[PDB]
Amino acid sequence: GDLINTVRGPIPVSEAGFTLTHEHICGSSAGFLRAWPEFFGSRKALAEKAVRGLRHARAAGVQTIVDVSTFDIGRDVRLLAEVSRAADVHIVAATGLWFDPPLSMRMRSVEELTQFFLREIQHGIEDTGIRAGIIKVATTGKATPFQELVLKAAARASLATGVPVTTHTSASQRDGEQQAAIFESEGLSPSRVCIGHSDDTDDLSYLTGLAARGYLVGLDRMPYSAIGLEGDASALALFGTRSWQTRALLIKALIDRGYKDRILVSHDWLFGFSSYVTNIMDVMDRINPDGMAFVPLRVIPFLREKGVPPETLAGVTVANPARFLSPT
Numbered sequence: 001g002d003l004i005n006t007v008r009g010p011i012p013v014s015e016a017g018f019t020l021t022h023e024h025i026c027g028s029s030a031g032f033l034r035a036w037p038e039f040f041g042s043r044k045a046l047a048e049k050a051v052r053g054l055r056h057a058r059a060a061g062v063q064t065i066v067d068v069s070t071f072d073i074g075r076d077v078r079l080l081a082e083v084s085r086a087a088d089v090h091i092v093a094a095t096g097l098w099f100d101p102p103l104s105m106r107m108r109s110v111e112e113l114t115q116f117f118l119r120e121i122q123h124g125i126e127d128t129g130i131r132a133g134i135i136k137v138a139t140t141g142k143a144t145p146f147q148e149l150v151l152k153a154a155a156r157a158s159l160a161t162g163v164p165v166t167t168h169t170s171a172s173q174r175d176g177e178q179q180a181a182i183f184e185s186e187g188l189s190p191s192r193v194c195i196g197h198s199d200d201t202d203d204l205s206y207l208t209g210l211a212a213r214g215y216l217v218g219l220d221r222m223p224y225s226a227i228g229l230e231g232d233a234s235a236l237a238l239f240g241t242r243s244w245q246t247r248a249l250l251i252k253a254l255i256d257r258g259y260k261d262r263i264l265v266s267h268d269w270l271f272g273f274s275s276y277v278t279n280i281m282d283v284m285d286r287i288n289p290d291g292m293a294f295v296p297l298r299v300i301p302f303l304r305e306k307g308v309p310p311e312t313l314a315g316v317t318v319a320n321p322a323r324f325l326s327p328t
């Protein structure tokens with residue numbers, strides 16, 4: 001009955017199945033894939049890599065990914081539709097703004113940003129008719145003045161459409177608390193919101209405080225670890241020095257504290273990555289050759305072997321994303 005928009009059109013919520021709620025086909029910048037496709041070898045090479053990766057995920061049981069690339073992450077919805085079709089994996093596209101908005105966005109009011117998010121949800125992205133099914137926002141510490149506007153615009157767009165909001169945080173700085181305060185100031189329900197990158201911290205006081213208020217807690221960087229690459233400063237800064245098992249333990253922790261229905265799990269993976277240092281994709285591909293199959297192949301069995309019931313693991317990977325993505 002309930003439906004969600006994907007880059008291939010509407011699908012029943014019940015067909016979303018096992019869903020990775022924070023992912024990227026390509027982490028880039030607005031206009032960049034059009035201006036400089038050779039950065040990625042070629043657009044064709046990038047697509048082929050993405051198709052191989054999504055087929056691998058699919059083989060491991062993933063049926064849907066939420067590509068949370070916004071305009072300023074250089075989201076290319078035609079690319080998403082091409083790879084979704086070829087790999088037979090659903091892709092939900094995003095509106096919103098990450099932390100690299102250009103001046104044409106940064107100069108905008110809350111009202112104007114709301115119109116833009118609404119356009120991408122209700123009308124379509126660019127000239128494609130593909131509708132966003134999620135709204136992505138970001139802070140990296142205390143919100144900038146502009147980021148405050150973005151979070152308010154995200155709340156308003158969500159209220160008008162029922163589409164959920166998902167966030168990038170600096171989890172070590174506990175951004176989720178201010179994000180929550182801003183969302184609530186606009187009257188947005190916490191159940192419409194996922195506070196992302198929350199597995200970047202082991203601060204369970206912070207995480208359970210959010211979960212208790214009804215927020216979804218995005219444990220979405222599972223394979224991120226620069227353990228063994230301490231010589232690579234850019235890898236250390238991005239990936240951290242905590243193991244995937246450490247990250248995965250937070251899923252169990254929240255389940256053990258009663259919060260199984262408030263957890264979303266993902267990788268924050270990608271198949272191309274131009275917004276960071278050159279060759280970062282090769283480093284990442286070495287850290288996690290499994291890509292977006294890492295959660296089903298490593299994390300879910302790890303949790304099972306720690307005694308998490310199959311029903312609970314299905315609730316986390318199927319029921320929670322379905323409830324979150326269903327327009328409400």
Ligand SMILES: CCOP(=O)(OCC)Oc1ccc(OC)cc1
Nearest residue numbers: 024027028073168238268275276
């Ligand atoms: C690794 C994925 O997370 P990120 O927010 O990218 C979204 C596509 O990563 C960053 C990208 C650029 C940065 O510049 C300082 C920092 C993080």
Ligand SMILES: [Co+2]
Nearest residue numbers: 167168169197
């Ligand atoms: Co992010």
Ligand SMILES: [Fe+2]
Nearest residue numbers: 023024068268
């Ligand atoms: Fe991301």
